[PDB]
Design a protein around this ligand. Structure first.
Ligand SMILES: NC(=O)c1ccc[n+]([C@@H]2O[C@H](COP(=O)([O-])OP(=O)(O)OC[C@H]3O[C@@H](n4cnc5c(N)ncnc54)[C@H](O)[C@@H]3O)[C@@H](O)[C@H]2O)c1
Ligand SMILES: NC(=O)c1ccc[n+]([C@@H]2O[C@H](COP(=O)([O-])OP(=O)(O)OC[C@H]3O[C@@H](n4cnc5c(N)ncnc54)[C@H](O)[C@@H]3O)[C@@H](O)[C@H]2O)c1
Ligand SMILES: NC(=O)c1ccc[n+]([C@@H]2O[C@H](COP(=O)([O-])OP(=O)(O)OC[C@H]3O[C@@H](n4cnc5c(N)ncnc54)[C@H](O)[C@@H]3O)[C@@H](O)[C@H]2O)c1
Ligand SMILES: NC(=O)c1ccc[n+]([C@@H]2O[C@H](COP(=O)([O-])OP(=O)(O)OC[C@H]3O[C@@H](n4cnc5c(N)ncnc54)[C@H](O)[C@@H]3O)[C@@H](O)[C@H]2O)c1
Lengths: 458, 459, 457, 457
């Protein structure tokens, strides 16, 4: 595409920076340093690693506003939300420092007389391939537990946020993270292939599109390396007739429009029972129309420009196809004139399961509303997707909610509340949303060598 | 494919047993449709109902124990006593998971306050399983038992030389009352496997086999966004230091290398012996290997049968030939046995250095490699100088040293002063080219669950 | 989407949406192609030649409708869309006249006329085609493929499915038997399914390097031959002794035809130091005078670009080049409005490390690089991952011939305007692909070359 | 395997072991091939033709040593190994004489001699070759590849590295410049590395379907052209009016040459009802009369098979066919001993569903199927995933020619013995691969076909 990774401010359209792809010597140095870093880091105590996590949290908080400004500048997130991303990322460092060490204790087994245990050993260097939508949080979500487990972490970040990548590296270096334990490289696709195929890479973690996950997962499998693939979603948000309608509407608007809609686990498919459908729709449209869109440096704006001009083009085509298919445009559905990359907050109604807005991930500020005949129909519509990341259900019927959760084909179900990732719970999905789990003890153990140690088996 | 048929040939006699055509398009569609409809019902059963099915499977196996063991021996040459032990272990597995498995599926509390969020272990769907001939029953049930208990369907593609065993397993599980589609198998060729991996009704894939199979299947699963467990080859190190219980070390070494005529993923394959005890170990090991009885595997007194596949004997002999050309010292065997059957002599290669074929490749037959280590540090470095990393053994009276070395061994299982094995109570699986993912204990059960967060009232 | 979507790039407005082919439709396309081939392979070559004339006739009977469809779906100036129809119909007639002799059996040096080489049909050829010449790209391959006795099954670019339907109607009106020519709106999975189906004998791809690699890998895996006609970054060399005005006219036409959107466009201008400033001044003046706007207006030279995402990508390539140090002499901006227009653009002081030198710029952006002398010009020309065509302007005829021999590309134009033409080979080397189209090359690429030898005793 | 291992298949004993090329050695092979090409492409065709003559002279000077090496490493009767050397030397001289004219520029129909087609060198061609004709398979491609001005970089089968070393010595003695011909003992990862290196222009593979698929996929992904000359399961059709004595002679020679290990062997005998029993009786008798043993003993018609694992596989294909219902008329057993001998074998009553009909049987096993009539015979012949070559025996010249036109393969022999010959095209269709070797085809496959057009205005 280009010979450089290019940063362009999506609010203004103006070039920020260009960085050449890593050459052969640079890829080799990144791998060699990661390997020598790992060789030392794996021998450290868990207590030492936990202290390093605290130090990283401290350095991040010391540079918090510079970091948030970098995030907003390079990818357009409202500054209020970029600051929240920094806060959440730093808190993650402290949470794992506190709760992570116990997760690495050996497990007893049923083998007689305490003769066998399960140990959680470091695996090696983990190659991480990350996206631009949370340029800090996506990195730390994996890096924090991966480092605590005694592994090295080698990042290839999205080419539009290399400024953020450079800043994260500086902050982690200031915190005293040893050389090679955390590192990054501006590799092109060929460079990524080279690394996946190098024996110094033990495993791979990918957060990104379905296409990226398939292209990388195929290479990892071929190389006999484990993956965690955290890919797109088209999360259903089910509202039944007995819901608290106003709370459902508030959670819906927040779920769809957070980060200008640019969230894997955004509420994307609103599936509303016939009796409450019109009231939900009227209120949702009103709230969406009242969201403020503009300069993301302005603390009070709710929506920024989208991150990538080509992705705004693709989203508009998804809206165009949906309308051609028979969806009803209730709000927005236009690119905003000007040099920035703004797309109107949009609502499509009368969306049926055959339509683009129902079958593809809409990665921008476009809500799809589908009417369900009843709860059984709502469930069936929810599961009629190639994606399966998270889901929401609003209903006063607690027993029904719990039954529906068990039958929803996704990795997270939120009942009468706001979906989010949180260190304390598993994150990740099924079907084309990928596989593997992040956070809590799952994200820590995914990149361990789980090792049986058995004495005197005679 | 080599033929239009999956072909069974008795390796003791060289004679054709059976030939089965590859599944056609109708049969593949039927297997997939039935697996999907089976899963749709089975996912809705209670864990108590699934646990009882496991007991019923153990019961049915035990009712057909001798017929099952005879089929194993007939199709792939395993000594009959070992085939019977494989049946015993497999039935015991069914009972172990029926008892200990249900608790593994209980929801997990979280640190979210006031019991507002739990983690649930939900069924995933139909798991496609690609399995090898070396333990035609045990390798199937090792994964199938926990996969089934988790609420998944299991769809087997077995090794083409053991389709008789596959047909029998299916008979037994039907007798146990396993619902249609919940357990099933299909005689798919490689193209049929690809078609299934790419079908939305397959949720995930499990493979036990060679590095080459794992790479071919793992690539396809990744491309389809489907999780794998890859349980692949091993070249397990077996370290004996100067202070070992030498008698126990030799007994464990002989059993480790020569069980199933050498044909075991976690076999002791690379003996790494400290210089001070090397000669003593080598003398005892060679004499014990020389005393092993080889012949007709239906004869209980024979310790070693024929190898399962003629082409693989041939490959093994080339690996021995290459090793000798590279400088290895042949202390015992190293020849194919004349006759109609597929016998290879119990073999011992010494003076094996890390550059050699015997040190670098998986020797999947009755061929021991012995390498001398300067000291414990050299032994550890030699052990880790491998593309494989399945399991390992250390013999030393130094408890602390053993624990330190275990921590530094790049493999998924370490046995200190004992006999390596798989066991339901512990994790099994490796690192590096041995694959990834873990079987048995709670690991094999959770690998094929949808780990699902359920959080109410998050405001 | 779940649809192939047509959007008019001049207005931004949706034209049509077509669902991807389902399993039954893919099976129907393959089954019809195979049964079509089974009869077509048994026709006389002269009957197939007559069918080509009949196709040319039907295309000319619908010429303005066809040109309007091309302009409407992908933005090409209507004058150039009409010329695409004229060229495409002429190709039908040219192969009808000259093609049959190319399929005559060859004698061999085997004694007593006992062995001959026959050019047999191969089967159904799957064709994966781009939007930039929605008609010409299809016929460039289909005409000789059909004449050789094969069926042609087209998967067209998803933004020109209207053009694809119209081509099918026209060829059917001409009397082309069912299945001999056909098309299917397959998604990427449908393409893979067809490549792996035994009814597909071979594959031809015209498109991006990325498309060629993806499809070529699948064809190779299936043991099926390809022709891959992929992107270019053609060098256009101007030496001190050139006819400078002619060099400038050819340069402007070579870069800016089809709003820059041509595989064999002149993309890298490599100009000897002595004439560099004079060339640049005149090139920029001529480019600045090109008229851009509604492509329905016959006098506009430049239309909107075909695809919004591709305009976006091109602007980033310009942005990267400027950040690397290129000098913007003209344009370099998206035009405000609902259409997809990009200013005619010129980048100078371009050096070999820059985006504008290393990537294919598939839109109206010229790159100008100064060469120390003819040897430097040659080295610059060959310093590319692409190798489709090239132009050299110089009064020194011997030097031009020597340079042509050393240029790593499939076509060299000396003191003139590069173009594809039925009479000569077309295709490149390196990442531009492999295989050749047109003349006897395009005809024989999809033949089973068969030795028939009697009484070898 | 950590080494490429040579084992004498007549004795079962190790001959040699050679480590796989390491990173430095692969880099050196590529670097030398590229520098060799840079000079070689500048040589005159006359000089290259002289080098070919010099290679032919050098083979002839080492003819017996070469033949002995072939027999020693892969088991071929010594008389056949000598014939292999003779044919390879004659190929050098044939291309020396007839090749240069094939590189002449072509005129075009562009008026007034303004446009010509040139055949330019492409670059370094990576060759991946099999053990069955360790010398002839190499030269069959290397000779025309070199004459076209390319370099040739060989990866030979790991069981014939002694032969490979010897070939390199002979070509070096002949004065072939460094890097112009070279070889490297690469493992599969090393091959992948070279395919993906820009110094490799294109790839040629002679080998199994599995090998062609693995390599073809990689070349396609790298946007590099292939020729794939893969397995065959050639039909040999005998109609009721055939010259029966000649048909039997051709049938026996066709199946049993090189102990059956020939891509274009006659593998599927398809015999019309009326003549079936007479053909079968005579064929079985002739096959039973063939002598098998020590390939250094000239009386022996058949040697051991080359590879122990492949004998194992062949035996399983025979076992499966019998299990499916084939009738075993002769052989069908491994011969006891330390060598790798398999009995001359005949399977009859073979129907199209069977292993012996659907897979390539790469050893001394004939399959015989009965056809009800000529149409049935044609249908049986074409019911194959392979399509390399074919034979038809019939007294009727017109029927033979009609059937040849409908046979789905790259070569058809009418009333004679199939073979490759420099004067005619060689290669197949379907899973037998694509591309053609020999005559002008093997020379032009690895050229950059370049249009040069002056004054196009
Ligand atoms: N946790 C999750 O499940 C999660 C979280 C956030 C975002 N996402 C997903 O991310 C997507 C949007 O982010 P994006 O546009 O950056 O995604 P993307 O897939 O285009 O890129 C992600 C990363 O992969 C790299 N990449 C893509 N193809 C590659 C190839 N073939 N070889 C090497 N590297 C390659 C990119 O350079 C980037 O670093 C959405 O689909 C969203 O749902 C998922
Ligand atoms: N738990 C473990 O880690 C474990 C246990 C036992 C055996 N093994 C390994 O198994 C190997 C020996 O068994 P094997 O010879 O049956 O192995 P194999 O890899 O040749 O075959 C295993 C299975 O994979 C299938 N298969 C292979 N390639 C395929 C392809 N490309 N597409 C679809 N299916 C394919 C085979 O048909 C068979 O069913 C040894 O390496 C051994 O260590 C591993
Ligand atoms: N003759 C030539 O050498 C020549 C001529 C004209 C245009 N081009 C090239 O065409 C390119 C621009 O055209 P485009 O944008 O349509 O190219 P493109 O590569 O994106 O698409 C070309 C065709 O390939 C299909 N395609 C792409 N990836 C696929 C996949 N993975 N599986 C199945 N189908 C796939 C598309 O749907 C389309 O039909 C430029 O690089 C240009 O140089 C080359
Ligand atoms: N002209 C022809 O059409 C022709 C001529 C003679 C033989 N053959 C075919 O050759 C086959 C038998 O020869 P073989 O056993 O040597 O075949 P083979 O395919 O196993 O090996 C051929 C070559 O390919 C290499 N190879 C195989 N897989 C590879 C991989 N994945 N990566 C890199 N290199 C790889 C081998 O090392 C060897 O050099 C038969 O099928 C026969 O029909 C074809």
């Amino acid at each position: 595409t280009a010979t450089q990774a290019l940063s362009v401010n999506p609010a203004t359209g103006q070039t920020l920076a260009a960085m050449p792809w890593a050459n052969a010597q640079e890829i080799e140095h990144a791998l060699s340093l990661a390997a020598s870093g790992f060789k030392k880091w794996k021998m450290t105590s868990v207590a030492q690693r936990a202290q390093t996590l605290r130090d990283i949290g401290q350095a991040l908080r010391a540079h918090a506003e510079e970091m948030a400004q970098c995030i907003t500048r390079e990818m357009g997130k409202p500054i209020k939300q970029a600051r929240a991303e920094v806060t959440k990322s730093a808190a993650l460092c402290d949470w794992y420092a506190e709760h992570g060490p116990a997760m690495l204790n050996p497990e007893p087994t049923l083998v007689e007389n305490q003769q066998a245990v399960i140990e959680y050993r470091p695996l090696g260097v983990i190659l991480a391939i990350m996206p631009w939508n949370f340029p800090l949080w996506q990195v730390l979500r994996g890096a924090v537990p991966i480092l605590l487990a005694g592994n090295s972490y080698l990042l290839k970040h999205a080419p539009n946020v290399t400024g953020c990548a450079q800043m994260i590296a500086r902050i982690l270096a200031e915190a005293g993270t040893p050389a090679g334990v955390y590192g990054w490289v501006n590799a092109n696709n060929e460079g990524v292939s080279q690394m996946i195929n190098d024996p110094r890479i033990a495993a791979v973690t990918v957060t990104g599109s379905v296409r990226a996950g398939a292209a990388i997962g195929a290479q990892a499998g071929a190389a006999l390396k484990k993956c965690v693939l955290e890919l797109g979603g088209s999360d259903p948000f089910i509202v039944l007739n007995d819901a608290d309608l106003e709370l459902a509407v508030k959670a819906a608007v927040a779920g769809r429009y957070q980060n200008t809609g640019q969230v894997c686990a955004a509420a994307k498919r609103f599936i509303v029972e016939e009796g409450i459908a019109q009231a939900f729709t009227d209120r949702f449209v009103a709230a969406a129309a009242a969201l403020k869109m503009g300069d993301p440096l302005v603390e009070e704006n709710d929506l920024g420009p989208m991150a990538r001009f080509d992705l705004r083009d693709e989203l508009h085509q998804q809206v165009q196809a949906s309308v051609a298919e028979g969806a009803r445009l209730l709000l927005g559905g236009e690119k905003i004139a000007g040099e920035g990359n703004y797309y109107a907050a949009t609502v499509l109604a009368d969306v049926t399961p055959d339509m683009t807005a129902f079958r593809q991930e809409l990665f921008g500020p476009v809500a799809a509303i589908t009417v369900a005949k009843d709860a059984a129909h709502a469930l069936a519509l929810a599961n009629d997707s190639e994606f399966g990341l998270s889901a929401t259900i609003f209903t006063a019927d607690d027993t029904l909610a719990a039954e529906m959760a068990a039958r929803l084909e996704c990795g997270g179900v939120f009942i009468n509340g706001y979906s989010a990732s949180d260190a304390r719970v598993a994150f990740g999905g099924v079907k084309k949303s990928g596989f593997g789990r992040e956070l809590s003890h799952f994200g820590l153990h995914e990149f361990c060598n789980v090792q049986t140690v058995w004495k005197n088996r005679v």
